[PDB]
Symmetry: T
Subunit: 160 residues, 12 copies
């Protein structure tokens, strides 16, 4: 009775600006994963084990987030681009030092990197939400996870 | 001090009839999607039969979970869901499925169209549902994104280069 | 030495009457699943929780049974039809009431529905078994499960 | 290269009003957990087992919700206060009776207290959403869960 | 539509002879469980560990079989009676010795008792199958399991 | 090497016949409790059937585990348990369980009485068992705890306040 | 007041040589099916390679379990199974598998025909096996319907519209 | 049948009001320990944050399980536990936990002191509890063991050798 | 707040040197039992090899867990365990285990004797340990129960009836 | 950059001699699996259960090893041949007796068969390793597992 | 009677700069393989899309595990891995992946060639790595055969008869 | 066919030098396990929890390694000797201190003892690999695991 009598019903399509914003999020997530693995390998010093395990947890979370963002881009008829050259040439995260680093320096660096990653998502959020609340919810989840990880990492260096 | 309330019977949030009707529309489309997905799951045949067979079962599981969530939300908001077969058949908006064995390309086309119809209904309902209750709007967002991911995974088989 | 010299060996094929009997079973299983979900949602009153959980168990069992029957139909070169219009127009289960119902009424209604579903299987059993004992075994399993569920549901209203 | 230069990138901090609203939510969640445990221990009568198990599920949900809220406060650079004296002096939930109670009375009391807990979250939701949609999402999840638990508990005493 | 009009469709009820046959099976299953536990505790000698574990497996199988039979009786509107006095007065298994026994004697005794238990089921099978193939299937499963356990236990004393 | 004992065969602790009989009483009562719990589990009908149906299964599982533990302790202490049906029927102390279907209130009363009888037997045996072997007294403590919790969970249904 | 049997040595059910031979036929066909399924699993190439690769592993697992069940039933009925390689090769009825790499369609056809041959053997044996022992006939029914489901899942790839 | 008791209603062990208050003290101290453990878990900062953050969660879980066990034992022995927030705040013996963020050394000292206070309360009540019911004394032994192991694992951080 | 203690540092229970030595004896015997159990597990041959091979692994796991529990209790009670190889070898009381391959009967006899020696040591220590700390006496009870069950399960192989 | 400018890069290809040596290994693994199952079924006598379970473990290990070897052949562009006629006509293991056998005879036979299977691998090891250390590692694992299984089986008959 | 060493600071094995460089080459190729595998996983479209989608995810997981293992081995051998994005992009040897959506056959070809390049690099490095440290050569063998199995499973899709 | 005729094919037998080398490995593994447990119990100071958990992981690894070595010795027809007196008299690890130690001292001591254990295996590796590459593979795995544990432990005391 209420059935729709057509055979071609097409889905929601993302705008190029929306795809660009999601690309901006994805590149930073991938770079965060790579730098987290770097710090996970080369951290050394007092209280080494806790940082060694927390950085692995952060890397797992960032990998899951990047996969979720790229699959959302695919679902919205966009084309993600996560190649190494593109990530290196278009990421906004500061470069990571190349040698062994103490735990305090690693804590500071990782906190700054997570803060930059969250800032990118916060800048993208209003424009994304103006079109797709479903994508805005994914952004909310990413922000929650990243901020929790940032707290758990930064609390080591607090003085009170 | 003491900030405790004295009232002994505090009542909860009650939904409006229009809100209940919108949730009923979403529920009936989810149920019809589950039934049609099982039909396609059984009667599909041809190339990539195994992949279509498994993906349609995943879609059916997702749709069943979504319909249960929507109906329980209506129950929590003091509404009465109606998921009877006669009501679903008479009030669903998805086009009817073909009766006999179908090739995999035809099944891909049909399932993509029906998933698109379901998400279109949810998107039509989302504005009023969000205006009344963002807690229910969150469930609507979850359904929309899950269904769109399933639609991508199913439709990508027929896409050319 | 004893190897068969054939290149195409064909399997067992079901008769249209056998397919019709299995369709009769399948339609009632699907309608039972739908009515069980409806009662699961709309039940209310004393001893609400046990009915709420038992009806979910019954729905899971009925869904598994319908899938098994339809896959057996496919294996025997038959075509199941589980569309909503077909189920609504050809089911034998009585119609379910549309509003909130007390637990005693739900117990009575669900017991009646399960009894009708079992009666259909018992009616088609001899004709099915005359051709396919392998399908008769599936019918035996369905009857066992449905009767156990009916006992567990109906025992609530017993007075002794 | 689009990499940032800043080496001390800072994060998002919450306002005192935001911290106060989250404290208002947290104290009610803790008090709900304590009262749920009390009702779980001291309930007697018909449907005792179902009430016993449902109240334990509600307590588990309230505990995880309070933990989530407090960790979000820590992530946003706020300081939660979940001490017994603070909860007792600042909670808004009505006081729970001290002796053994029948299941109908426990159902009424627990439904009332869950409704009060949900009302607090609904009161703070507008401001917390205007400041941080990421926290608004957590409060949406809390409201959904609490309302489902309220329905499951309260359906026992419905007449028809 | 083909929906039924009746609102009080009744189920299948068992005859007193059917109930008696199922009681005959049930008492032997319970006695087999008790004697298996006795032999499990009081066995000594060579291959003690293997006998100790195999008898526990046999007891578990007998317990689940007795539960299945009694629940089938309940589903078919019969009343099982598995009290200690009834089992002791009406069982057909030979009495078990009261003290510590070597493994060869335990093997012989347990094999004889399993054979008697299987013989009872084979005696009642024809009538129970003529009445209810659904119950005949459960008895087929019981016979299969008991005979496999009997083989596994009895193979220890075989010469070559 | 300095403190090593030169003994070639060191034997363990052996239980007296009084201790063996004290454990035999507990064993036969646990077995009879398991049998009566299964009977009540099968034949209970009436209002609130499901909760009692499941709690009786929990009680039967606990009683079976306890009887196995007691019999294995008897074996470890060089005693010979006797859990045969004739012995249990002739020497158990639990009152006989009635036949036919019973309502849930009657089943609650009967099961509470029989659990209390079992706990009373364990308490009577505990003094001598503890005076001889605290390791066995600990097992008795565990059994009393479990049985009393089961008794509370079962009897609270029929309470009136 | 005692129905206990006096006989101290009670013997079980013994199978006939014809029954043992029928079960031997079923066993040897199951073993040959497992071997050929593994061969096809290794040597298949072409389109839908992954799907056939996984499905053939599932079929091989099913056939191995079925052969074990049949042989253990033979042992329980006081018969002696013979699953040696020479006996299987000299007495199996399945046509031999090709020696080299095969395409997907060829593997589908070959495996479908071999599964059909195995099911035909079991169906030929079922009448006598059921006439002697319905307990073994039940295992035969389980093998038949499992193999037919596997045959449907494998053969559905090559069907047209 | 010969030794069966003819009693129709056998009642169980009942706890005295002194015993009930003795268990109430343990209950309120365990609840306050759980609350203060959660507070310290949230608000701890400084060097070696993660290990203390996780150990405090372990301590809170143990204390919650212990309080549940004590209250259920009170219910089984016909007593009425009182774990309301007002009662805990008014009648607990643990010293008040300071507010705001605290370094890890201060948290270690505070948590060690409060665990020691809880164990001291349990040790004070143990004599009378054991003199009345060894079954409850066993629960007290388990609580003391767990709390002392947690105290060692937490306090070992500040040891200087 | 009314009953809160004003103490700023509350210390816990401390063990005496005699108590520490009483626990040290149990510790060294458990460690030596683990080492000899592994030795017998590796070097046993003869009839019924597999059952003894697996039971000795179970015994070794139990002894390792028990030694860890005892040492952690010593740490909790402010004692210092010493489980070094030289100390164990010089102060253990278990008789030396013979070298080379041994038959299963000899291994059964040796392992039974050494388990009995360990249990005898624990029983000798139990009186003073219980007189000082029932919480530690409970751990001793658990160890005695487990070791005696293992001894029964191992020694029952050589029984002749 | 250091990126390679090729569109089709060839892999490692196995020589026919290497394929033949792996075929020699595979045939013996398959024959060992079949003979292990036969001994597992037909073993009987004292200590029956231990052999019954150890032979299952041996068969599982041999099946896994044969699958690994055949998949390595496929990866190295070779074609395995595991047909029944080929195995029967080209295996090196001695024929297995056709009837029920005591546990001592089964121990001797299985030990001999495992020794022959290990001897084949040891014979082909040097030639395999001269080309592919990656395949040599698989051979090492097979030898370790087979020798451990042989020790566990053969220790039953040891007299000291 | 003591073979204990007197030296108080025994140092471990240290790798050479050439060894570190070879392991760095292996690591950078593994990282680039993971990135390109994820790219192909996202942007593959056409026939057999589901199988390619799942297999590429399996390959990415394997490559990630291998890169972690290699970097941890360098850390254990006192070397410093460098897995930064700029370094990977500037020093990897795998040819770059195309930018847009690609069909199934093209993805199969590209991934096969890149896996072959990675395993070729590992084979080039293996000789020196084995000459210095067989413990690291073992990890190299594991990487080689895992990657070759993945390459077979992926490339078999396009193979003809 | 190609079937062998021999019925008593024998296996590979180890030389006394091989047995001595494996005994040298085994005694050091056992002593490492004992000293790891000692350090696990008696460690105090900063990062106590991390040292406590890492030493337990090291003890588990050493236990499984010693079991693997002894079972390989048994498979190769050798007789391991892991008695307490033998370990104490023939081990090469330095003696461990007897009282409570700070975490830095425990880190130094455990790193030294792990290095000695690895040096023993590296000393015996050439001969054991010249005789049996299958055993050389087990020693490769042991070396890899021990060196990873040594890195994870010593990284705590590294300056920068």
């Amino acid at each position: 009775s209420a059935r729709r009598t057509e055979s071609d019903i097409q889905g929601f399509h993302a705008t190029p600006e929306f795809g660009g914003n999601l690309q901006k999020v994805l590149v930073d997530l991938i770079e965060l994963s790579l730098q987290g693995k770097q710090a996970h390998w080369n951290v050394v010093g007092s209280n080494f084990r806790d940082l060694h395990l927390q950085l692995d947890e952060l890397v797992d979370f960032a990998r899951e987030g990047s996969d979720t963002i790229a699959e959302r881009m695919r679902a919205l008829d966009a084309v993600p681009d996560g190649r190494s050259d593109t990530v290196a040439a278009t990421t906004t995260l500061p470069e990571f030092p190349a040698f062994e680093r103490s735990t305090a320096d690693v804590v500071d660096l990782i906190t700054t990197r997570i803060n930059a990653t969250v800032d990118t998502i916060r800048r993208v959020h209003d424009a994304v939400d103006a079109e797709d609340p479903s994508t805005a919810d994914l952004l909310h989840g990413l922000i929650d996870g990243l901020e929790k990880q940032a707290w758990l990492i930064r609390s080591e260096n607090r003085k009170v």
